[PDB]
Design a protein around this motif. Structure first.
Motif, PDB file in Angstrom:
ATOM      1  N   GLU A  82       0.834  -1.199   0.000  1.00 57.08           N
ATOM      2  CA  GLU A  82       0.000   0.000   0.000  1.00 57.08           C
ATOM      3  C   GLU A  82       0.873   1.256   0.000  1.00 57.08           C
ATOM      4  N   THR A  83       1.788   1.347   0.956  1.00 55.27           N
ATOM      5  CA  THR A  83       2.673   2.502   1.049  1.00 55.27           C
ATOM      6  C   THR A  83       3.706   2.522  -0.086  1.00 55.27           C
TER       7      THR A  83
ATOM      8  N   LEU B  17       6.166 -11.477  -2.822  1.00 51.13           N
ATOM      9  CA  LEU B  17       6.832 -11.288  -4.100  1.00 51.13           C
ATOM     10  C   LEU B  17       6.517  -9.907  -4.675  1.00 51.13           C
ATOM     11  N   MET B  18       5.272  -9.461  -4.550  1.00 58.45           N
ATOM     12  CA  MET B  18       4.938  -8.139  -5.063  1.00 58.45           C
ATOM     13  C   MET B  18       5.672  -7.076  -4.261  1.00 58.45           C
ATOM     14  N   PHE B  19       5.641  -7.215  -2.941  1.00 62.37           N
ATOM     15  CA  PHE B  19       6.341  -6.269  -2.092  1.00 62.37           C
ATOM     16  C   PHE B  19       7.842  -6.266  -2.395  1.00 62.37           C
ATOM     17  N   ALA B  20       8.428  -7.449  -2.496  1.00 65.69           N
ATOM     18  CA  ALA B  20       9.846  -7.545  -2.759  1.00 65.69           C
ATOM     19  C   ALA B  20      10.290  -6.778  -4.006  1.00 65.69           C
ATOM     20  N   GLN B  26      12.071   0.920  -5.473  1.00 63.59           N
ATOM     21  CA  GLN B  26      12.274   2.183  -4.778  1.00 63.59           C
ATOM     22  C   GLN B  26      13.741   2.240  -4.394  1.00 63.59           C
ATOM     23  N   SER B  27      14.149   1.235  -3.630  1.00 66.83           N
ATOM     24  CA  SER B  27      15.513   1.081  -3.143  1.00 66.83           C
ATOM     25  C   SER B  27      16.611   1.498  -4.123  1.00 66.83           C
ATOM     26  N   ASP B  28      16.490   1.120  -5.390  1.00 63.19           N
ATOM     27  CA  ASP B  28      17.529   1.490  -6.344  1.00 63.19           C
ATOM     28  C   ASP B  28      17.213   2.764  -7.134  1.00 63.19           C
ATOM     29  N   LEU B  29      16.883   3.820  -6.395  1.00 61.38           N
ATOM     30  CA  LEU B  29      16.565   5.135  -6.954  1.00 61.38           C
ATOM     31  C   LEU B  29      15.875   5.984  -5.887  1.00 61.38           C
ATOM     32  N   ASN B  47      10.186   1.940   9.439  1.00 58.20           N
ATOM     33  CA  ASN B  47       8.845   1.411   9.680  1.00 58.20           C
ATOM     34  C   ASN B  47       8.633   0.145   8.864  1.00 58.20           C
ATOM     35  N   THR B  48       9.043   0.190   7.601  1.00 54.89           N
ATOM     36  CA  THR B  48       8.937  -0.965   6.726  1.00 54.89           C
ATOM     37  C   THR B  48       9.504  -2.175   7.456  1.00 54.89           C
ATOM     38  N   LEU B  49      10.742  -2.057   7.928  1.00 48.80           N
ATOM     39  CA  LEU B  49      11.395  -3.147   8.646  1.00 48.80           C
ATOM     40  C   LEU B  49      10.566  -3.633   9.837  1.00 48.80           C
ATOM     41  N   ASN B  50       9.991  -2.695  10.583  1.00 49.03           N
ATOM     42  CA  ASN B  50       9.185  -3.056  11.744  1.00 49.03           C
ATOM     43  C   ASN B  50       7.946  -3.837  11.352  1.00 49.03           C
ATOM     44  N   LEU B  51       7.222  -3.319  10.369  1.00 51.09           N
ATOM     45  CA  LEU B  51       6.011  -3.966   9.896  1.00 51.09           C
ATOM     46  C   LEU B  51       6.375  -5.315   9.288  1.00 51.09           C
ATOM     47  N   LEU B  52       7.506  -5.338   8.596  1.00 48.65           N
ATOM     48  CA  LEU B  52       8.005  -6.540   7.943  1.00 48.65           C
ATOM     49  C   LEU B  52       8.443  -7.615   8.926  1.00 48.65           C
ATOM     50  N   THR B  53       9.030  -7.207  10.035  1.00 50.69           N
ATOM     51  CA  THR B  53       9.469  -8.170  11.035  1.00 50.69           C
ATOM     52  C   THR B  53       8.279  -8.695  11.844  1.00 50.69           C
ATOM     53  N   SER B  54       7.256  -7.855  11.972  1.00 54.17           N
ATOM     54  CA  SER B  54       6.042  -8.217  12.686  1.00 54.17           C
ATOM     55  C   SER B  54       5.372  -9.348  11.897  1.00 54.17           C
ATOM     56  N   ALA B  55       5.299  -9.162  10.581  1.00 53.08           N
ATOM     57  CA  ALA B  55       4.725 -10.144   9.672  1.00 53.08           C
ATOM     58  C   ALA B  55       5.492 -11.442   9.800  1.00 53.08           C
TER      59      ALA B  55
END
Lengths: 84, 72
Positions: A82-83, B17-20, B26-29, B47-55
């Motif tokens: 989403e973000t 896979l979509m997120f990855a 984004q990461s490479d730019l 935050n990404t990392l936090n939400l990602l680690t929670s998952a």
């Protein structure tokens, strides 16, 4: 400073990439969970202890705890997409 | 599969896979701007990392509870 910022972005990126691989791995390990669950079926044929376990599992994955844990993780990933 | 893991995991794997790839994209730019934008990226990435680690933790509890249940 620019340098600290770069070091922090690299850290995060690496941390994030690890979390991705970890998840991809966890997903793969779920085939073992798949196989195990099917074995529990076979044993359920003759054994009622197994049958009761299976049914508890089934309810768990449909409207129980497992399903909620699952929805939780899935929505967090969807929130991430989403973000973006 | 008795507990429809196929669809559960397939949809979950598709989310990942979509997120990855999207993250990968984004990461490479004025210097002030530059310093601020990066500080913002660091905030988001965090935050990404936090939400990602929670998952990740959730998927683990899932595994643990499942396996625990198949054995008692």
């Amino acid at each position: 400073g620019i340098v600290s910022q770069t070091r922090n972005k690299e850290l995060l990126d690496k941390k994030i990439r690890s979390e991705i691989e970890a998840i991809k791995k966890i997903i793969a390990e779920f085939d073992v969970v798949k196989e195990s669950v099917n074995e529990l079926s076979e044993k359920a044929k003759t054994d009622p202890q197994a049958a009761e376990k299976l049914n508890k599992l089934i309810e768990g994955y449909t409207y129980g705890e497992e399903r909620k844990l699952y929805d939780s993780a899935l929505s967090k990933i969807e929130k991430l997409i989403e973000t973006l | 599969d008795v507990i429809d893991l196929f669809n559960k995991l397939g949809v979950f794997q598709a989310a990942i896979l979509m997120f990855a790839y999207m993250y990968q994209a984004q990461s490479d730019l004025n210097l002030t701007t530059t310093v601020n934008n990066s500080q913002l990226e660091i905030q988001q990435m965090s935050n990404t990392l936090n939400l990602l680690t929670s998952a990740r933790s959730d998927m683990q509890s899932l595994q643990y509870r499942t396996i625990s249940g198949i054995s008692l």
